[PDB]
Amino acid sequence: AAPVTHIWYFKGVPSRLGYLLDLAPKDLEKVIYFAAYMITFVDEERRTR
DNA sequence: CAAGGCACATGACAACGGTGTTCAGTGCCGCGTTGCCCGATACCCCCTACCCGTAGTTGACTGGCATCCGGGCGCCGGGTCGCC
Numbered sequence: 001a002a003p004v005t006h007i008w009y010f011k012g013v014p015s016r017l018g019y020l021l022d023l024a025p026k027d028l029e030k031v032i033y034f035a036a037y038m039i040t041f042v043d044e045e046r047r048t049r
Numbered sequence: 050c051a052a053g054g055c056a057c058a059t060g061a062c063a064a065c066g067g068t069g070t071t072c073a074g075t076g077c078c079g080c081g082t083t084g085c086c087c088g089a090t091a092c093c094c095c096c097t098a099c100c101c102g103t104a105g106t107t108g109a110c111t112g113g114c115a116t117c118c119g120g121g122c123g124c125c126g127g128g129t130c131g132c133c
Contacts, residue, residue, distance in 0.1 A: 013126070024128090 005032050 010017050030036040
């Protein structure tokens with residue numbers, strides 16, 4: 001019903017995780033296990049307008 | 050002595066003898082195929098017995114669990130906060 005993440009690619013050395021998103025492993029651990037939020041997208045141009 | 054007369058046999062003449070063949074008809078015994086008759090067997094019904102899922106039960110009752118060390122051994126590799 002709700003998507004999840006493959007344990008293999010994350011929680012490891014940075015050749016498999018890869019820093020594909022420039023976030024520290026602590027951030028991912030705190031986000032994918034429901035301990036912090038994200039800003040998936042902002043209308044920054046709209047906010048500035 | 051030659052011609053004309055009578056006996057026995059003779060060129061054919063069919064029809065019996067006896068036996069072999071012809072269409073044909075019908076069976077006579079051999080080999081194989083067929084309607085019955087039942088008998089069991091799959092397949093509908095009704096009845097209720099029991100398995101299994103759902104929904105209540107109101108004194109009060111509001112944060113746990115036992116971890117873990119005698120590897121051992123080294124490296125990678127990244128994080129991580131001091132350093133000046």
